[PDB]
Design a binder for this molecule. Structure first.
Ligand SMILES: OC[C@H]1O[C@@H](O[C@@H]2[C@H](O)[C@@H](O)[C@H](O)O[C@@H]2CO)[C@H](O)[C@@H](O)[C@H]1O
Ligand SMILES: [Ca+2]
Ligand SMILES: [Ca+2]
Length: 109
């Protein structure tokens, strides 16, 4: 099961973890350019991309992921617990942004 994450940070210290069924597959430190990050698992289950090290000046943007060849846009996902929206952390879904610690759920593998 191949999973590619296309993502960037605002300052390049930002850390994201790819999780599958509650298991952490891989963790990466992002750069300020949108770039691809790839991982693989034999596991199935819910995919999450989690921003874990929010601090003054850090924000994550996930464009999309690609799961076994199939594109899933971050902005088409309904659960986003880190976006700043409606004047609060995790204030909406359907966003590329994780401003606060939180994750975007991309559903089952
Ligand atoms: O509430 C603390 C929270 O704020 C975040 O920033 C939001 C928003 O993302 C910015 O665009 C806006 O300029 O400022 C607000 C808060 O005033 C932030 O990204 C988080 O890391 C938290 O600190
Ligand atoms: Ca996108
Ligand atoms: Ca932030």
């Amino acid at each position: 099961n191949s999973i590619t994450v296309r993502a960037r940070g605002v300052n390049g210290q930002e850390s994201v973890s790819l999780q599958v069924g509650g298991t952490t597959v891989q963790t990466w430190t992002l750069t300020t350019a949108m770039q691809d990050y790839t991982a693989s698992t034999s596991l199935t289950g819910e995919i999450r991309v989690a921003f874990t090290n929010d601090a003054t000046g850090r924000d994550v943007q996930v464009d999309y992921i690609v799961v076994n060849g199939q594109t899933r846009q971050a902005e088409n996902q309904s659960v986003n617990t880190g976006v700043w929206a409606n004047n609060q952390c995790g204030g909406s879904g359907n966003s590329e942004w994780l401003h606060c610690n939180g994750y975007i759920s991309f559903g089952n593998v």
